[PDB]
Structure formats: structure tokens, C-alpha cells
Symmetry: C2
Subunit: 189 residues, 2 copies
């Protein structure tokens, strides 16, 4: 469910010509993104098991000329790809949160976009690491279970070598108090 | 010109407010109620207190000594009238001072600093859109800057002291980042939206001087139902 939220949150304008997914598993995010962009997508997965399915899913869906898997560690991969991507998106799980954000800055084009989903307790630390690697936080969205609940999940978008100022989108409430998904959540999926 | 009015539905609370100065807002009320007022907070400080609406509300919940710092002398006079009028002279004191220089002179004195800062930076003629220099000096960063407020809050606070702020949501990371720069660890956060479909316009943020990491993101506050009426959650803050 995280992966559907982070996918639809990605700001997919026409400047996106090359996108990357950190720790792509079955390539669910690339496949979802596929339905909104013509940019070439690259998914990076450290485990061969997941590589077969993701490749299988790109085969089954006939996007082999748009999406591609790469069997690598995000850290080593990113040192090899300076100023490459318009978007890096990562749905985190030997790789720390600082590693993900550093790696993202090592391989984004200037004014490119880094999109992450994570636990709400970690918002201030992610914001400090964004700034430590010259990523300027831009869009935030909170995820709450019910209207009376503390947020569990945050969605965070930032621009590498961008300017200052945030946009905080209307909080998302996943389900009503009957434990039925809210109409708002249904727009996703 | 001063007018006397009740401080929303807070019982035994009235306050004068001048039409050519800043009049309190929902922001003032919510940042007062968002403060943590546990028994350890023994001394409190309001940065830029104006007519002292924030102390007047905090006092309904704690017996701590409350100091209000304010720079515009016409407001200190109104503030001191409101404290006497409500008989709070024993608890609340007003000091005509600059936040910066006050903080340099009263270092490590407080367990809690709260602040409803001027929201807008300086960019052109600030008075062009205001009715009076005294309003412009409350809404724009002409006599104080955001970094000054946070730096000053760190000079005034004591270990495990608590800085509480309300501000525009566009500047949340800037604020987060200035917190870390002065060793204030963000802890509690709540977004305020007008409507369930609107972008958050305001944030409430709290953090601990020389504390630890870890954030609690409280449920978003919607202030209006789609029918344009105050929500029931908001009306809970209109009284004690
Ligand atoms: N440098 C400074 N030192 C002390 N107060 C200052 C200041 N610069 C601005 N202020 C004051 O800060 C206030 C900001 S408006 C906040 C009003 C009030 N605390 C409320 O919640 O409604 C103004 O009254 C302004 O005079």
C-alpha cells in the first residue's frame, strides 16, 4: 500500500525523461509510473530473486522498451550515474536512511526530484538530510488511519539544487471509522 | 482606539485591543493551547506578546511565572492593562525589550518559550498593504527575523527546555532546519487546514533544547466543515 501511494505522489511532468527506483522489488512502482509517463525507468534491486519477477512483470506487460532492471546496490550504482535522472523514487525497507538520500543526490540532474515515503517519526531527520545534500523539500503529504489518528506515514518530495519553500498537501485519511477505505483513498488504486 | 472584549469563551478573561495595532487571531489561540503545560514548566516566556493574549490563556492552565517580551511600547501599555484588568499581576509580567537582547541578558532562564512570530519576510514596502506601521511591524520581519527568534529561543532555554512556535507552512523545513542549527530537536507537529480538501496553511511545532530525535505528528486540525462552520474540534479551543 505504501508503494501505490508513493507512485501516485510522484510529480510526473514532461521534463521527466529518465527515472529511477531505489530498491524496486517486483517493479510495481515502475509499472504504475508506466501508466503516466513516457520517460525511461530504471529499477535497482540487490537480490536476483526480485530481478526475475520484475523482469517477468515488464515482459508480461510489454514495456521492455521503457523499463529496465539493474542488479546493484543503490550506493555503488549511484556513484556511477552523476546528473542522470529527473526523478528518483524510493520506498525504503545494509542501507541507512542517510545512504538513500546521499545516493539520490549523487545521481540526480540539477533541479531533479527525489520522492520518498517513510515513517512520520522520521520527518525532521529526513528534512535535515535533504538539506545536508542540497535537496530542497517541496511537497509533503501526511497519512493518517482515521481522522482522529496520529499520522503513521509521510510522503516527501524534494528538488536537488532547488530553491526554498514547501507545499503541504491535504492530509490523507485512509479509512473511515467503519474500517472502510475512504472515498479519497480510492482515487489511488 | 482601545475596545474591551471577551477572550472568546475563556471564563474570567477579557482584554483590550487597539484598532491600529495587531489584534489576536486563531493562530494566537492555537499556539497557546498547543503548549505543553506540565508541572515542570515553572517559568514561561512569550516572544512578542502584544496585548498579552497568549499569557492570558496559558494562565488558565498553570501557575507558572509568565514573562511577556514586547518591543512596541504602545503594546506594552495595553498588555499591562490586560494583566491588571484580569488581576494576574502576581503571575504575569511584561518587559519592554528586544527579543534578541533580552535573550542575551536572561540566558538559560526558562523552561518554555512560545512565540507567534511575524510571518512574512521583508520584500519591498511592507506598509503598502497595512494600515499602520504597528501592524506592519507585527506581520512582517522588520523588527525581528525568524532565525533571530529561534536563536534567541535557544539562548533563553535551559537543558530540556521547550520552544513552541506557529508559522506559515511554506517555511516548515526552514524552521526544522533552524531548530537543528541551534540544538533544538523537533518533537511535536500539527498541521492546520481550513477545509478537509485545502492545503495546510499553518503549522504548530514544538521541540526540546538539547533533547533527542523523534517526532510525534498529531492529527491534522481542520478548522471549518464544508458548510463553512467551525468544526467541533476547533470550538474546543474557543474555551477552557
Ligand atoms: N524584536 C522584537 N522584540 C520583541 N517583540 C517583537 C519584536 N519584533 C516584533 N515583535 C512583536 O511580536 C509581535 C508579533 S504578532 C504576535 C502577537 C501575539 N503574541 C498573538 O499571539 O496574537 C508584535 O506585537 C511585535 O511587536
Amino acid at each position: 500500500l505504501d508503494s501505490v501511494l508513493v507512485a501516485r505522489f510522484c510529480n510526473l511532468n514532461s521534463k521527466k525523461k529518465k527515472i529511477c527506483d531505489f530498491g524496486t522489488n517486483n517493479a510495481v512502482i515502475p509499472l504504475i509510473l508506466s501508466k503516466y509517463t513516457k520517460a525511461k525507468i530504471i529499477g535497482v534491486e540487490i537480490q536476483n530473486k526480485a530481478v526475475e519477477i520484475a523482469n517477468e512483470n515488464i515482459k508480461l506487460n510489454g514495456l521492455e522498451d521503457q523499463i529496465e532492471i539493474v542488479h546493484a546496490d543503490i550506493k555503488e550504482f549511484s556513484k556511477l550515474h552523476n546528473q542522470e535522472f529527473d526523478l528518483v523514487v524510493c520506498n525504503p525497507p545494509l542501507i541507512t536512511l542517510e545512504d538513500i538520500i546521499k545516493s539520490a543526490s549523487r545521481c540526480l540532474k540539477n533541479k531533479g526530484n527525489f520522492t520518498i515515503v517513510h515513517r512520520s517519526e522520521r520527518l525532521s531527520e529526513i528534512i535535515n538530510l535533504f538539506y545536508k545534500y542540497n535537496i530542497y523539500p517541496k511537497r509533503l503529504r501526511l497519512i493518517q488511519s482515521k481522522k482522529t489518528d496520529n499520522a503513521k506515514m509521510i510522503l516527501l518530495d524534494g528538488i536537488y539544487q532547488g530553491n526554498e519553500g514547501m507545499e503541504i498537501l491535504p492530509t490523507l485519511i485512509t479509512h473511515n471509522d467503519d474500517e472502510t477505505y475512504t472515498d479519497e483513498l480510492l482515487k489511488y488504486f
